[PDB]
C-alpha cells in the first residue's frame, strides 16, 4: 500500500456566536472524513458510506457516549487555559491525534494541541514528554507529566491501537482509499508555462519544472485542490526568459509513475 493515515480532530470555542457548536470532533482517513460529532447533534455519525456499512449501531452508540464526555472535558480544559492566559472573549482550543502507516511498513504517531490556532502542547511518544510553547502550556505539561501512566497509555494508543484502527478502516474503504486515478497533464502558455494536472487520486502529487535538465526556486506552485468528484487538480508555473530559449519540461510524479512533458 501507499502511505495512509488516521486522525481525529477536536475544536472547542469558548463564546461561540449563536447557532455555532461549542464543540466539534471529526475523524479522517487520508483526506476523507469518516466520522463527525458536535455539541448540537450530540451524536457520533459516519461521514463515509463505507463507515456506515461496516460499523454496527453499537459502535456509534458507544462512541457517542465517549464523545459526550470528551466534549465536557474539552470545555473544562479550555476554561482553564483562558483563565490562565487572562483572556476575555471567544477563543479556540484544538486537538489532533493520529498515526501513519507508511508504504515500507513503518509507522508514525502524533498527538498535539493548539490554542487560538497556534501550537500549544506537542507530545513526544519516544521521550514520553510534552513540549510546551509558553508558560501556560508549561503548567499543563507539569500536571500531565506527573501522571506517567497516562503518557504510557497514549504511546500504546498511537503505536498499536491507532494503527489497528487504520488497517481496519483501510479495508472497509479499500475501493475508495486504495484506488489510483492517474493525472491528465498538459502544458498551457499564458509569458509563463503552466503545467496543469487534473482528475487524479490520491491527492499526493509532485509537479516541478526542469530547465535543460536542472531543477528551476523560480517555480510558482499551485495548491492541490478538490475538483468535487473525488479527484484533485493542481498546477505549477515557470516564467519564460524573453531573451533566450531553454529546454523546459514538466515533471509529474504520482502513485509510483513518473511523467515528463517536454515543451517544444
Amino acid at each position, epitope marked *: 500500500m501507499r502511505t495512509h493515515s488516521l486522525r481525529y480532530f477536536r475544536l472547542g470555542v469558548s463564546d461561540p456566536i449563536h447557532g455555532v457548536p461549542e464543540f466539534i470532533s471529526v475523524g479522517y482517513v487520508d483526506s476523507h472524513p469518516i466520522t463527525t460529532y458536535d455539541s448540537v447533534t450530540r451524536q457520533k455519525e459516519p461521514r463515509a458510506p463505507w463507515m456506515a456499512e461496516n460499523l454496527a449501531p453499537d459502535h456509534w452508540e*458507544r462512541y457517542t*457516549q*465517549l464523545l459526550r*464526555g470528551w466534549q*465536557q*472535558m474539552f470545555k473544562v480544559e479550555l476554561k482553564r487555559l483562558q483563565r490562565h492566559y487572562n483572556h476575555s472573549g471567544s477563543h479556540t482550543y484544538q486537538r489532533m491525534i493520529g498515526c501513519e502507516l507508511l508504504e515500507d511498513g513503518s509507522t508514525t504517531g502524533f498527538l498535539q494541541y493548539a490554542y487560538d490556532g497556534q501550537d500549544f502542547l506537542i507530545f513526544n511518544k519516544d521521550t514520553l514528554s510534552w513540549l510546551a510553547v509558553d508558560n501556560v502550556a508549561h503548567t499543563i505539561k507539569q500536571a500531565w507529566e506527573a501522571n506517567q*501512566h497516562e503518557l*504510557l497509555y497514549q504511546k*500504546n494508543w498511537l503505536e498499536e*491501537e491507532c494503527i489497528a484502527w487504520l488497517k481496519r478502516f483501510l479495508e472497509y474503504g479499500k475501493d475508495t482509499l486504495q484506488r489510483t486515478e492517474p493525472p491528465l497533464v498538459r502544458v498551457n502558455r499564458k509569458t509563463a508555462l503552466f503545467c496543469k494536472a487534473h482528475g487524479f487520486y490520491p491527492p499526493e502529487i509532485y509537479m516541478t519544472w526542469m530547465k535543460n535538465g536542472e531543477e528551476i526556486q523560480e517555480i510558482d506552485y499551485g495548491d492541490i485542490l478538490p475538483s468535487g468528484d473525488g479527484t484533485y487538480q493542481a498546477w505549477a508555473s515557470i516564467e519564460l526568459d524573453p531573451q533566450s530559449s531553454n529546454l523546459y519540461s514538466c515533471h509529474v510524479e504520482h502513485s509510483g509513475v513518473h511523467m515528463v512533458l517536454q515543451v517544444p
Partner: antibody
Amino acid sequence: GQNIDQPTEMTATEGAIVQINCTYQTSGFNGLFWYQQHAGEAPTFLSYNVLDGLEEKGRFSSFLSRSKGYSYLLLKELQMKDSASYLCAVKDSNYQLIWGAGTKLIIKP
Amino acid sequence: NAGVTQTPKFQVLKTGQSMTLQCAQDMNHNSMYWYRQDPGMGLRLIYYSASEGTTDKGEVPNGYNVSRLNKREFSLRLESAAPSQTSVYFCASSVWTGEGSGELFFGEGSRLTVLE
C-alpha cells in the same frame, strides 16, 4: 468473543512469593488493571500496565506482555493481610472494562 | 473526603417490588457506574454515565434503569425485583471515561436478596 482468565484460587505460605496470572483475549488493548478485594469489602486499585515490562510498587509488582496477552501480579514477603481476592480487568478498543472472575489468595501462617 | 457513598448496605425484597439504590461521589468525578458482582464471574456493568447529563446501558441492563441526577449522584432502580437480581451491587466513579489509565473508585456495596 472477548475473554479474561485467571485461576479461581491460589494458596501460598506466609513469607513466600506468589504470582497471580491473568490472560486476556480482547478486541484491542488500552491497559490492564489489578484490583484487590478483601472479603466483604469493595475492590481497590492496585496497579496499571499498558506497555511491556515489570513495574514495582513496594511488595507488589505487575508485569505485562502485550504480544502474549498476559499479565501477572507478583506479591512478595506474603503476610496474612494479603489474603483477599485479586481481580484483573482489561480495557478493550472501545474503552470497555472487561473483568476477570478474580483469584482468591489464601495464606498459610 | 468521603469517596463513593452508596445505600442501602443491605436490603430484602419480595419478588415484584421496586427499589432504588443511591450513590454519591464527592471526588468531583465525571463518570459513574453501576456493577453487579456474582459468584464465579467477573463484575458486570449494568448502566453507566460517562459525564453529567448522559447515561447508557452496560452489559446487563434488563430489569434496571438509572438516573444521573447531577454530577455527584447516580441512582439505580430495580423495576420489578426478580430472584435473579439477588446480587451485590457496586457503584463506582472515575475522573473520566475513555481515557486510559484512570482507575475506578468503588462504593461499599449493596447486598440485595430477592425472595418469592
